[PDB]
Design a protein around this ligand. Sequence first.
Ligand SMILES: [Cl-]
Ligand SMILES: [Cl-]
Ligand SMILES: [Cl-]
Ligand SMILES: [Cl-]
Ligand SMILES: [Cl-]
Ligand SMILES: [Cl-]
Ligand SMILES: [Cl-]
Ligand SMILES: [Cl-]
Ligand SMILES: [Cl-]
Ligand code: NA
Ligand code: NA
Lengths: 377, 377
Amino acid sequence: GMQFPSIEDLRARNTMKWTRYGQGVLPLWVAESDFSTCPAVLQAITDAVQREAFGYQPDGSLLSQATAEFYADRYGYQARPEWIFPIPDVVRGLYIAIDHFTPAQSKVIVPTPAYPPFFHLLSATQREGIFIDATGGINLHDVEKGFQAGARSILLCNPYNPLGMVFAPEWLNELCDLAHRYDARVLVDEIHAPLVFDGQHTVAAGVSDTAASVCITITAPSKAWNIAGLKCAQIIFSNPSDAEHWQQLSPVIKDGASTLGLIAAEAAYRYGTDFLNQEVAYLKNNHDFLLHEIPKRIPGAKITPMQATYLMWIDFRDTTIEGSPSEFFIEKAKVAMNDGAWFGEDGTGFCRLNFATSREVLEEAIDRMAKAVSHHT
Amino acid sequence: GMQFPSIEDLRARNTMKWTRYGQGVLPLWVAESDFSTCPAVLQAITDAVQREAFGYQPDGSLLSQATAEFYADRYGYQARPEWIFPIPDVVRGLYIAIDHFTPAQSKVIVPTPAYPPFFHLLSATQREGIFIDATGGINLHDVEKGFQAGARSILLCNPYNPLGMVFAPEWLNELCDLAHRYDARVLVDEIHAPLVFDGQHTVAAGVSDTAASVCITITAPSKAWNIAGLKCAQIIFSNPSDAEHWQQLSPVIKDGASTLGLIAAEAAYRYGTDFLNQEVAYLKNNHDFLLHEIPKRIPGAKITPMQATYLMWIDFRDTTIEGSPSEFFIEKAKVAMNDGAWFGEDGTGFCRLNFATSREVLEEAIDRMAKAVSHHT
Ligand SMILES: [Cl-]
Ligand SMILES: [Cl-]
Ligand SMILES: [Cl-]
Ligand SMILES: [Cl-]
Ligand SMILES: [Cl-]
Ligand SMILES: [Cl-]
Ligand SMILES: [Cl-]
Ligand SMILES: [Cl-]
Ligand SMILES: [Cl-]
Ligand code: NA
Ligand code: NA
């Protein structure tokens, strides 16, 4: 089980999630969760503020060790802490990775539907994307065709949001062998890895010696422990040459993490596992509930079963809703989900629903939607 | 007057300042202050943590208005809030400014002695610096020669750290006219502007219509209110074309500010002025004390009177100390100051001393130095 603040206290968090839409609209959109903050993480932040830890980051951080120990305990990956480094956030890590660890101007394979900031990542790095369809899984043949068309890296979310997918180890093994044959890198975004509820996360970088060479692994405790605004993520290298190359970069390229964020992240990794296990159990139950009920109450809605994350991709193309389903549900049901068109052109007609909230909130949301949809124009 | 935490509580802040050197070494180096945090700022952070404001930043921020109102009240500059934007920190703003608002590969005039991160800024942007001597002030003839040698921007700290200088308005006016004649930008770093204790800060961007076009102004409350680790600074544009160009940049280029940092910065600007005035009065007194006593107790040390900042540039070249004076004082006096060689090659023999601490700490520090220096090898 999990604790939740009152709905009043949730709004009073005064984050993007609660300020984008009106007071009557239930927000099930941006990836922040509604769980009361993990007690160990909240206390670490509270104590740091009381201590006035507001200057520059201290020497002697054990965050890299904490990260390595978490990777070892949870996934059986023996990460080297000397190859783990702080960064402000996961997308900034991917930005540095493309800009400094792939050849200049080289195309980047981006599976779709894609985490919407990935399109901004392409514009920021000035790289052309090669888009491949990840719906129902990724075909390695599509990946090879991208490399044959000139791509020198692939961005791989694992777990794969917004589809809730957990890639198999032998699949990651062949992906890395393929990348190596084309002198390409695999940039693995593992921000959702703590949130697997049906299956097991495999760290791609550890499936082979080839994988260790081709992967650059990027993660944060920000999704699982809900501290995105504190700015602390981790870059996990799996070979000495990448770590050396990182160390040679100007500090200005690598800096940004917040002092409080370093403290919150370390506490999450060291003391947040019990909470994580309860969180994941609660998400699995919400998932099973939504998977059954949504199609029964909102006719034509289709959902594919998931294995990880709190983000549910719903197909509304078999409804007869006019225009964007997201906009319909905001205006007529007072329930906010992300419009799938932001994830790629083939996301049109889909919505992404955030189920990291209470069963009560989910019931209310689907009931509002069930009524509104019964007489949409 | 000002409050200070106990020396035990200062160490327990566990920031870079307190963790670089051993327990017996008084740290007067990195630019963090030892004042108890401004009560209004501390309470804003405390309340935000209690509210669990840990997700993404909210819509409807009034930080730009707060910044504009501070600029108006303190300096008489009527900044437009719609031209003010958040960034993670001041150096990141300068990085974006060089990379996106000056021509590709164009040289950058960097006065010396220089804030040490400026050398990392040059390596990160891949630009060659044209170094001019700022000791005793900046000669506009040296600036013109730089532009004639191809530079298309100048980095201008105003107030100028580490020399404590406050530039005159008619000087800023001619600098901007000069820059305009060479199609160059003036990138004004005003992070120390709240900390003028003898004179008045002029906002360069407001001295003329030409200045409004050529300047890009970058600041933060991080120095004056000691919140560098919270990651929130401001970019202040002074013409619509720059603001438009900023808005057209990929969000990935511009993001990074922390949620708590946005909250702390707004509180600093809205409610921190009384504290600021007491801080500045305390710094002026520390400055007057050090200016008189250092030369009397540490023979050969020379100091030029300052008008702003809490960073004192001390010349030890007329001592007969062997090797780096910074290293001598760390090893033999247990007092840590920055080695001037990090500020440029002509900084060798200088140290930078941070006097944003108690008179008690300063007395103890100069006394340790006075004894050690009496029999240096
Ligand atoms: Cl999101
Ligand atoms: Cl806990
Ligand atoms: Cl997503
Ligand atoms: Cl930064
Ligand atoms: Cl510093
Ligand atoms: Cl106050
Ligand atoms: Cl300085
Ligand atoms: Cl940042
Ligand atoms: Cl960022
Ligand atoms: Na992150
Ligand atoms: Na700053």
